[PDB]
Design a protein around this ligand. Structure first.
Ligand SMILES: CC1=C(O)[C@@](O)([C@@H]2C[C@H]3OC(=O)[C@H](C)[C@@H]4CCC[C@@]5(CC[C@H](O5)[C@H](O)[C@@]5(C)CC(=O)[C@H](O5)[C@H]5C[C@]6(C)CC[C@](O5)(O6)[C@H]5CC[C@](C)(C[C@H](C)/C=C(C)/C=C/[C@H]3O2)O5)O4)OCC1
Ligand SMILES: Nc1ncnc2c1ncn2[C@@H]1O[C@H](COP(=O)(O)OP(=O)(O)OP(=O)(O)O)[C@@H](O)[C@H]1O
Ligand SMILES: C/C1=C/C(=O)O[C@@H]2C[C@@H](CC[C@H](C)/C=C\CC1)O[C@@](O)([C@@H]1CSC(=O)N1)C2
Ligand SMILES: [Ca+2]
Ligand SMILES: [Ca+2]
Length: 352
């Protein structure tokens, strides 16, 4: 079976039963008659997925064909294919993915799983609450015995690309100039290399104000060496206080809490003890300790709280897919070509 995890920024693709994706490449299509993903990267670019939701279907077909043919070297008509989706995904989109897989790619079998749920599986759990934060969107997804609890899911627009754009803004306020699309990629690299989550925002602002102890240098492609100081932790602080970029949302600690509070009292303790971090935007050093501190301050004083931050969490959605698609007991769960022929795209609602 194939496993394809389509993100707003990065596609992760490979074979069920493997420990890691074979291909990780940008979720882009480029035109000057069109180039896809890593081919487009080597050369106007469009992202077919926005905030985790597929919005350009023709370009999404290009991404999928590139995945099957170029990245995995397979004919999709010969492999059951597991795909992933956002924890909240419009009904019409679920049908269109299904329609395309059966009618365009002629897959023999298909299934679509919620991204955050797969990450939980990759951590060795069937119960817990996942914070999955990527390039385009963030969700909190409470999960009991393998199944997301849809009424308790929380969503934030805020994710990694917004964090990059904010780092550009505050570095520009410092006296640099980061405004172009190329500069966006440079600042993404700065973010990934040098940013971290402060345990206490104010305390670290004070250290940065009165000393150079938190400063790091970065050699730009153009040869200027810049210095990054409080920007290192101000950038990801936005996750905890979205008002830094004018967003009204609760921060990720409060959305975690709010999600747990919408669940049955009998499972809340299990959720609090199994907070699993997923996605590239959870990679900041310090994030687990900060989450622990913030959730402790919101939760009952008696509550046992644990934040799990798997080292492999850039790829845990994919790994979870690999685990699920290669389970013997999953064999009966696939949507078959016959089922699709009889029920149409609407089959996805009954089976996934
Ligand atoms: C099995 C299967 C389905 O459950 C599902 O196909 C679900 C069921 C449908 O839910 C639905 O028709 C409903 C959405 C669904 C059904 C049951 C309960 C519920 C789930 C969560 C909750 O109410 C409510 O939206 C919350 C409290 C969560 C939240 O963060 C805020 O409101 C805010 C903030 C914000 C920043 C502003 C608004 C949003 O919520 O974002 C979310 C909520 C919806 C959306 C507009 C984003 C998109 C593009 C998704 C839509 C329209 C999804 C529709 C459906 O997805 O953004 O909504 O998803 C994938 C898997
Ligand atoms: N070490 C790091 N520190 C901070 N951010 C990082 C790090 N590594 C990757 N990221 C960010 O993670 C994001 C990519 O993560 P991921 O692959 O989980 O997202 P996606 O699946 O493409 O998007 P989404 O899930 O939002 O649709 C990018 O914004 C990237 O800059
Ligand atoms: C190395 C890498 C990282 C990434 O996450 O890439 C995804 C994919 C990408 C598409 C445009 C880019 C020119 C191509 C490849 C870069 C891929 O845009 C992102 O970099 C966007 C733009 S800045 C940011 O933080 N996210 C994230
Ligand atoms: Ca993702
Ligand atoms: Ca706020």
């Amino acid at each position: 079976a194939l496993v394809c995890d389509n993100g707003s920024g990065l596609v992760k693709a490979g074979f069920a039963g493997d420990d890691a994706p074979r291909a990780v490449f940008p979720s882009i299509v480029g035109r000057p008659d069109s180039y896809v993903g890593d081919e487009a990267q080597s050369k106007t670019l469009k992202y077919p997925i926005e905030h985790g939701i597929i919005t350009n279907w023709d370009d999404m077909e290009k991404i999928w064909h590139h995945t099957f043919y170029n990245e995995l070297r397979v004919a999709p008509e010969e492999h059951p294919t597991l795909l992933t989706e956002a924890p909240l995904n419009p009904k019409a989109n679920r049908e269109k993915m299904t329609q395309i897989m059966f009618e365009t790619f002629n897959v023999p079998a298909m299934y679509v799983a919620i991204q955050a749920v797969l990450s939980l599986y990759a951590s060795g759990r069937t119960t817990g609450i996942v914070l999955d934060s990527g390039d385009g969107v963030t969700h909190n997804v409470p999960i009991y015995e393998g199944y997301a609890l849809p009424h308790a899911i929380m969503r934030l627009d805020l994710a990694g690309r917004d964090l990059t754009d904010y780092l550009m803004k505050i570095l520009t306020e410092r006296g640099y100039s980061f405004v172009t699309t190329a500069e966006r990629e440079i600042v993404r690299d700065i973010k990934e290399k040098l940013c971290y989550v402060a345990l206490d925002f104010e305390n670290e602002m004070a250290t940065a104000a009165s000393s150079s102890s938190l400063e790091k240098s970065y050699e730009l492609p153009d040869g200027q060496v810049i210095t990054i100081g409080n920007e290192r932790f101000r950038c990801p602080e936005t996750l905890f206080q979205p008002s830094f970029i004018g967003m009204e949302s609760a921060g990720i600690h409060e959305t975690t809490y709010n999600s747990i509070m919408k669940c049955d009292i009998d499972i809340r303790k299990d959720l609090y003890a199994n907070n699993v971090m997923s996605g590239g935007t959870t990679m900041y050093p310090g994030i687990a300790d900060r989450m622990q501190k913030e959730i402790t301050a919101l939760a009952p004083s008696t509550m046992k709280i644990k934040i799990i931050a798997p080292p492999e969490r850039k790829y845990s959605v994919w790994i979870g897919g690999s685990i699920l698609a290669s389970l013997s007991t999953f064999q009966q769960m696939w949507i078959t070509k016959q089922e699709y022929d009889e029920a149409g795209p609407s089959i996805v609602h009954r089976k996934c």
